[PDB]
Amino acid sequence: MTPHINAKIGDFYPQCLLCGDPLRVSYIAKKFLQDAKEITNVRNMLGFSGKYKGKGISLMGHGMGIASCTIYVTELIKTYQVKELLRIGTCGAISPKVGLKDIIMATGASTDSKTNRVRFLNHDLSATPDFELSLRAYQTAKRLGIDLKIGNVFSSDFFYSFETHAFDLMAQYNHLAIEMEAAGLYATAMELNAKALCLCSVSDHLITKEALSPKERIESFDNMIILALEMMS
Amino acid sequence: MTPHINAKIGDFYPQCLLCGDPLRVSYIAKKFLQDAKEITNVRNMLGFSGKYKGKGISLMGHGMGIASCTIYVTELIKTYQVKELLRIGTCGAISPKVGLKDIIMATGASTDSKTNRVRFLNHDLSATPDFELSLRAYQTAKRLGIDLKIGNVFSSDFFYSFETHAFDLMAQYNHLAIEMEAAGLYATAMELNAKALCLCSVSDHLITKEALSPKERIESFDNMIILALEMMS
Amino acid sequence: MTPHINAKIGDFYPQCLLCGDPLRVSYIAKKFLQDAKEITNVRNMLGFSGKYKGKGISLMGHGMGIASCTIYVTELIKTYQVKELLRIGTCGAISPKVGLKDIIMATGASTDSKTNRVRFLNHDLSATPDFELSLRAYQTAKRLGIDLKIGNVFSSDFFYSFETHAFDLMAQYNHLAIEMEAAGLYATAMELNAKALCLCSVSDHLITKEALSPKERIESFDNMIILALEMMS
Amino acid sequence: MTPHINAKIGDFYPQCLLCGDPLRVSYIAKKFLQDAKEITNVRNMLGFSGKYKGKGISLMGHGMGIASCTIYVTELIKTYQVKELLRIGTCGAISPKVGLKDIIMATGASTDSKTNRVRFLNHDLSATPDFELSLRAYQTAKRLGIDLKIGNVFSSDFFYSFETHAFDLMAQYNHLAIEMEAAGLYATAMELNAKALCLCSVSDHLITKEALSPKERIESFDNMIILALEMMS
Amino acid sequence: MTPHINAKIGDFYPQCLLCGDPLRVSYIAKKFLQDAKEITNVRNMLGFSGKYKGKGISLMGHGMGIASCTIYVTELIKTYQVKELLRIGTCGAISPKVGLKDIIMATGASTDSKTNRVRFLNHDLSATPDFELSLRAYQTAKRLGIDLKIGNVFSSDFFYSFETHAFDLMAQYNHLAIEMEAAGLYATAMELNAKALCLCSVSDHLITKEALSPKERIESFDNMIILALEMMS
Amino acid sequence: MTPHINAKIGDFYPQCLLCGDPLRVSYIAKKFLQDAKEITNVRNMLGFSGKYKGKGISLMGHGMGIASCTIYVTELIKTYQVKELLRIGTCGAISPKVGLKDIIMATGASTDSKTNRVRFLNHDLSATPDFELSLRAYQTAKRLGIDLKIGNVFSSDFFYSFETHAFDLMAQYNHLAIEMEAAGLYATAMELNAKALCLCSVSDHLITKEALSPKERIESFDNMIILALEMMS
Ligand code: HPA
Ligand code: HPA
Ligand code: HPA
Numbered sequence A, B, C, D, E, F: 001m002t003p004h005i006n007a008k009i010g011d012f013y014p015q016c017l018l019c020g021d022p023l024r025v026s027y028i029a030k031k032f033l034q035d036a037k038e039i040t041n042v043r044n045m046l047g048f049s050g051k052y053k054g055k056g057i058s059l060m061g062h063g064m065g066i067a068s069c070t071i072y073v074t075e076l077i078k079t080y081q082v083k084e085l086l087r088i089g090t091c092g093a094i095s096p097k098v099g100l101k102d103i104i105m106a107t108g109a110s111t112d113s114k115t116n117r118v119r120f121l122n123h124d125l126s127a128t129p130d131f132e133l134s135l136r137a138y139q140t141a142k143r144l145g146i147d148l149k150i151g152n153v154f155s156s157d158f159f160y161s162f163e164t165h166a167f168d169l170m171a172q173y174n175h176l177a178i179e180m181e182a183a184g185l186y187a188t189a190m191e192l193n194a195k196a197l198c199l200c201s202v203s204d205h206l207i208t209k210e211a212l213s214p215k216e217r218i219e220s221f222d223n224m225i226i227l228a229l230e231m232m233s
């Protein structure tokens, strides 16, 4: 029991997929899992447990931004004993080497947040995923024929911004897209000794100005979902 | 249309109540409004429009943390033309001058976030509410007999923390409680020329270690809700 | 006894008006008080005690800038037991909604100083006035017919600056004027549990380039002075 | 004409002594100068011009703290064309190698202010005096038999502080005393191409807890005053 | 031609091994390469080109610390067109999961330097290696039977330090060791679009207080050297 | 014995000259010293002891950048008991008041490094040389007829940079040139109670775009070398 999660200890399997959108979490539960059970629903933030190809797997929403994400994965790990967390989110492309609905594997998450300086003695924490998990994503993607765009993302506290050249500067330093949680996920998992990785599909393209719709941000990423399930098997 | 809000321009009245919990938003819509209509539900984040004592009033969830809160109130103001925003949230008491379920009116919101330094040339932005709105809360509370605890809050990116003396230091500087959105609400509303105020009821007490339950964080604050509705009339 | 104040404990009433200019302090003592007594004069920084409409009231200069201001109000509170401090200063307008000699009530004081980060764990301290005092200023001003411009000010360590767009950015965030002490006054009073408020009359207008003379910065603000005396009665 | 200085261009000689205390400025004018004229008195901050051993010399108060000091020396240089500025102030000893009324020549001024980061692209500005001036102080002191304690000072925005080990750390890095203006004097003079130096006599000893009285901070430093006059001749 | 490198464009192969110690660079050139040629020797910082198993490979020293390292890899990439850089350095273990002469593959490099904030708009740059290169190290190590310790390192500007609990905090966040260049290597390579990776063998153990000798820091790491050569083939 | 220095305690005289280039150290040993002995050579970083005009004097390389420099002078002082350190380096002119091969005496070293904030409680450490040593350089230079350009330098973590106006800003604040170690030398020597000074000859001119060759950075500065030897006699 926590303020933000309804479940009981033991309702989460040691492996969990995460999205910011609890309706994408719910879409995965209905369409892709076998006998999925809704295990938590505080604040409308749904989580599920189910089976994929016989293997037990949980799903959990984490809301938008580092602060929200940190609340949920801190609770998932410390209270519910989750050991592997795989975010499958959305992001805004800043590279011309990626298009709408490309899947990005974030091997580092830069940030404009202060959370990691607060965690880490006002130094620069290099927020990174678990290496075996990213190895696992790479092999599963190749064994499935899924093209994976690999690089850094920029985890921002902001979605709306008048910046322009800051995006060029991020792209110049090999950042493929902008999202809002990976750096918090990575740092919390480092703190609490869990294995984490973040994949994100391109829902917005800041160069071409393309943007998916709310429901397309649920429905348009099934290869991302399949990759995540296949590697958690 | 935005990525995070379903409504159409015109579905929001110029005055809106806000909670982090969309189920508290929904509880207010059912119990306190007349003919409330669900106007948005992306990501399970519900908003409503309705009437209170004949006056039109909207409700909207904003999730947890400054980054989430900023997304929604940026959209509420710039896209949906909302002019007055009154957050009615929860907070964790750090003062022995306040107990569980006291209502705190935040006349300033300190923060450990970097968002305001990013907004404001790496200077110190004093995140404050609209003065008329806080005047309005003060008179409505006195005209209703509601005791209002008035002071600063600390808006943190963190809910879980091993800090101890940092809380004494916040209390020493007249901070009554900790929450996670007021400073973002205030700064975004300053940027976009809207009127904002944050009230928060004490759901956790960091001195006595009392903590309400998830549903009590919905149900235990009806004087806060009534005060907010009465001042938006 | 302190290095900077001559008076004896008990020479200050629990309520004190403050200016940066000790000659404005002296002007208020001569013209507006009954039987004012000079109680301190170290470094030419004059303070007085007197009566207004029968009520005892003290006056004290605090010099220019946060560091100077902090020295005097730290001593006023800790040594001389002053409980209410009302600065009545000058400021430079950055809003076209205010003209020369408008009175600004500062409900928040942003700053480019490091003093509050040093005080407050390198976080953002939202430097705010006492709420009852600002309520008291608002009602007294309306009961007297004085138009009060209400908003944030920016307390700078600098008077002279080549900045330009930084001023637009401050104005965009609802800052009405620039001065140099409010944030230090507010933070010191928060630390030491006194009630503080800052009013400032517009002596310079950064848009129109108007600027009062040294003596006009003493003489041109009698409604500010009257408002301050009337609320301390 | 400026907001803070009464004099006319030409009333200041190109060489000026400075104190925070305008009454120490006045004490030097009466006792040590020939036919001293009060040339400015805004805000009770007195300045004088006079002759010493036939050589013209000006005196000027600058108040307490970097922000105040910066206002006056910016005006002295840009408006009044002052070319050499020699502060002769007070300071609080943190070294056991110095006693009450020792004279300290500050060849660097560390600071806890943000002013130099604001001036200097958020880098570390090493605030230093003019070299010829410090050479001149060294030879004049030896040619007069005055023992000069030479080292860094720490220019703080704070006079009152509960720090303890921070003072040990400053002493460990060869800081002899704490004062409140040298770093601003040095940086402003660097900006505006004037020659500046700061001497400070020990008025407080933070180890032994000795502290001079307000008038002793005027009267107890005549060798400092004589050294300053002799080098400006 | 640069101030720091003697070679001619074309003397460096597109793949280069790097050490801080140019004598370790020289040891690799003598013992492991075929017909190695010394191609640069400014400041005694030796670089070589040679062949390993028929494949051309270069070696280059980079000195100690981020600033030194950045000079050399900026020149290697921009002037000499080097495309792949593989540092094989030394580090100080802070984990009890690693012993003297373990090989650490750094999938992120935290830092206490300001260089990446200067590069990256005062945000947090997550300094990471090229993913294919780390994949290549992982497979080559397994295909050779070399046990690879995988995790973050902390790149410090300091070798000597009285810190204690800061090391516990780094270890708590999954940092295996401390060194002094990886973060600069990674960030410069990100800027200039080269592929970089850092391996480091444990030469000091901060828990057990073991420390190798200067020559052992040359000679004790042949599996690291072999792994690097085998993956550059 | 240290990881970076071969010598034995007692092989260093209490006075040492320093260069970044160990080949400039070696050039001074051959050409200017009597019976110079190579006393250390770890990492190709050569140091020597010898006699000049009968007086014992040591030489030592320190590599490039603050981090490298700090390692060597920390060891020189704490392990080898060196008491006086005189860097004679190269720098890049940003003033039109200095030309190629001018000698600059650095009476302060600004920096873009974080090392001094880490050392000094995140305050501004004014990194300065020993005063007697700079007095000694000034008199020896005049007694020899050597023109000495005196002022601040900017110690950067970067050699290559696209900055432009930042250089104007440094020049505006009386910085004569850019180098990469003085601030670390000064701060380490302050920490460890040694006497340090930095001279630097202009090897690059950022205004005129002149740049010496690698060997000219060894050979073109004999008056600097002679001045350093003459003052250590
Ligand atoms: O454009 C974006 N910015 C930040 N987060 C996002 N998630 C999807 N798109 C975006
Ligand atoms: O304890 C708390 N901390 C932060 N936010 C909160 N909202 C309710 N309680 C808390
Ligand atoms: O223009 C100003 N700037 C700062 N403080 C002031 N006080 C009056 N005018 C000003």
Ligand code: HPA
Residues within 6 Å of the ligand: D090, D091, D092, D093, D156, D158, D159, D178, D179, D180, D203, D204
């Ligand atoms: O103790 C002090 N602190 C700061 N400034 C001072 N000026 C004289 N004494 C002091």
Ligand code: HPA
Residues within 6 Å of the ligand: E090, E091, E092, E093, E156, E158, E159, E178, E179, E180, E203, E204
């Ligand atoms: O202990 C160390 N600290 C920093 N760098 C190092 N390189 C080898 N050992 C170390």
Ligand code: HPA
Residues within 6 Å of the ligand: F090, F091, F092, F093, F156, F158, F159, F178, F179, F180, F203, F204
């Ligand atoms: O141009 C330079 N920049 C930094 N350090 C230097 N040392 C010689 N020239 C330079």
